[PDB]
RNA sequence: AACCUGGGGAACUGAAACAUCUCAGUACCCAGAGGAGAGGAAAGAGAAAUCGACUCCCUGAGUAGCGGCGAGCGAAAGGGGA
RNA sequence: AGCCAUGGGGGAAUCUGGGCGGACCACCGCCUAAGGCUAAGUACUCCGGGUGACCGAUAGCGCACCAGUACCGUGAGGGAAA
RNA sequence: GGCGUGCCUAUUGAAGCAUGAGCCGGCGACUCACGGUCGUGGGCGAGCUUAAGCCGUUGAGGCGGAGGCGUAGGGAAACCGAG
RNA sequence: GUAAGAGGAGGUAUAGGGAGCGACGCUUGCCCGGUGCCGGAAGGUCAAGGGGAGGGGUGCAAGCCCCGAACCGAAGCCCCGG
RNA sequence: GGGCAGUUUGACUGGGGCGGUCGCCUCCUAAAAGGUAACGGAGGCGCCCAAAGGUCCCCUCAGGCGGGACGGAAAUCCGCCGGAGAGCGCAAGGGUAGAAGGGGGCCUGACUGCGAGGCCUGCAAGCCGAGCAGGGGCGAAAGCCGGGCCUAGUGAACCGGUGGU
């Protein structure tokens, strides 16, 4: 009765939620195409994966037809 | 009596100064093919295990 | 197809991979070998 | 029933031949600042003498800290412990064979 | 009685199956030896232009190494003593 | 994969000889095969003696006792109680 | 008169119509060696410690550093060395 | 049965071994591709060995030591046929 | 070469056997973090590309309607409308034209040497990556490049093959 499979869940989402202090180059957003973008201080790769560019806070801001971005404001 | 130091333990196993059992890194010999330089590289570590490397200090102590 | 490039003047080596029937006949690329900076290269 | 973690690779070759162990001399490091301890013309001899050696014949007297402006005869120096030394006494190279 | 040398020589078993391996040259069978037996004057040991019959104890040392490099197996010189 | 040992085949030399030093070659070193005997240290415990943070009759040897008996088995063998 | 579903075991679950025991007495099951790894009580400490034996004792200990662990790590090694 | 040997048989194919069916009457058909068995001086394939173009290690060299193509190599299988 | 000998002859499983399945990706079941089971409901992978990679430059769909020799519902052309119903190698999903889609030019960073910090996680493993050094590539420069929009396209270790240092 071929319908037992499925797939060795990804377990994306956001990791870093807005107000939160993350250290230089961690990670911030695992997801799947673009429901998130980069932002201050704030690169991707490959997968989409939005990490910081230095440390500092994690906030998030919404521009509607431009979509949705997450970028880390510094402290120094 | 007297516990034979497990030899296919310490052929690739090496136990540090501080005490933390360093092994090799599995994942390069065989699979290879063109993986990225950044994958055969990030392979030629070494790197440390966790509470299996206290089953390991169990099997040498002579050594 | 498995390729492995290897280094004018010399005999260095890189990870790669051939087609064989696709336009892969000849393979003369680029790269940068070790002893000194910069040759070409070739199949096999 | 699986496989222990007997997946970690051996690397360790060199491991062994068949003859085995090969005679080859075993250089000791000893600190130097364990040698200022006590003073005179100190010799490997006088060194195991004491408690830091147990019979690896070549010692290799190096590290940090204040050498003594004595004489430590010993079969190999430290590029360190040399010019340190050198700032204190003497020090001759080793014997031969 | 046991111990000893030689001639033969298991499987259970362990490998969490099981063939190599292990159990082991053990069990046992046989022949021979004596208060012992065996071993023994180097076609030796092995890296010191050096040790110097043999036997045993300690050590070297779970080391060198052997092993479906798995289970596991496991020396020698040298040093200490008889 | 040397060395010691040897079932099968070929098959020397008498020191300007032969072996060994871990495939092999060269140098350099070790050694005298293809004959034989050798005390001692060593093991053992039927036997006798000593002793025990050993037993004290369902223990201690199976047997403190008329036990390798009674008895069971054709037989090897097993095997008490007291 | 009130109240009251044996024991162990095995179990999601037992008085259980699951297991085992007629009763009493005796016998009966986590030990030991060697090596580890903690902990602990001590002794000594850049040192600690002997193994076999030798001498002595006839319940008497002592000598014996061979060796062992420790003082430097890294590295497959050559090597280098608070790198 | 390791062998010596023994049965076979002090028998000799009107005999002995194995096999299946199972007094006796009438019968026992076609398939040989697979398998088995039998047959087939070729051929293909095929081991040890034989052979030594070529080349390796080494030595000052002579030499020594190793790798090794062609070719020659049985049963067996492949192939043909019953 | 069953005459004889030692062995193997998997697990899951509304008993077992038969049957079916065993790893990897996608969605659902999954109860708005993640995780989440059943012989639950449905499909995919064991690849493919030197152009499908890089970079600079340029351009933007499918669909509809109207006209248009072949053509004809749909080739190709233009007008008009068309925020994404197209496309993006292949299942699905998220995503995407304010490009990741389509064409062209030059090229090959389908780099070597490391890796800050995290994601995930019992282990092992998988994953993302700023930046430094050398040496380059496209671009006037800014810059961008450690393969492909991403998520399957896979195998500890042992034992061996060839190359070099």
């Not at chain 1, 195409?33 to 801001?61: C, H, I, W, Y």
Request: proline content about 5%.
């Amino acid at each position: 009765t071929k319908n037992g499979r499925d797939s060795q869940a990804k377990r994306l989402g956001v990791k870093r939620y807005e107000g939160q202090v993350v250290r230089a180059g961690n990670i911030l957003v695992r997801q799947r195409g673009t429901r998130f973008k980069p932002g201050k201080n704030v690169g991707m790769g490959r997968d989409f994966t939005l990490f910081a560019l230095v440390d500092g806070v994690v906030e998030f801001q919404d521009r509607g037809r431009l979509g949705r971005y997450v970028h880390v404001r510094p402290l120094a | 009596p007297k516990m034979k130091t497990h030899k296919g333990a310490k052929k690739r196993v090496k136990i540090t100064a501080s005490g933390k059992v360093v092994a090799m890194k599995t994942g390069k010999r065989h699979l290879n093919w063109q993986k990225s330089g950044k994958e055969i590289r990030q392979k030629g570590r070494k790197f440390v295990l966790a509470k299996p490397e206290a089953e390991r200090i169990k099997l040498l102590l002579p050594y | 197809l498995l390729l492995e490039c290897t280094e004018c003047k010399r005999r260095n080596y890189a990870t790669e991979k051939n087609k064989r029937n696709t336009p892969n006949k000849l393979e003369l690329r680029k790269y940068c070998p070790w002893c000194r900076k910069h040759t070409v290269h070739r199949e096999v | 029933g699986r496989s222990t973690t007997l997946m970690r690779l051996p690397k360790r070759g060199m491991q062994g031949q068949v003859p085995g162990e090969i005679k080859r001399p075993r250089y000791q490091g000893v600190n130097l600042k364990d040698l200022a301890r006590f003073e005179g013309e100190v010799t490997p001899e006088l060194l195991v003498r004491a408690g830091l050696l147990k019979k690896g014949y070549r010692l290799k007297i190096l590290g940090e800290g204040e050498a003594k402006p004595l004489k430590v005869v010993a079969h190999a120096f430290s590029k360190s412990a040399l010019e340190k030394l050198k700032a204190a006494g003497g020090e001759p190279v080793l014997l031969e064979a």
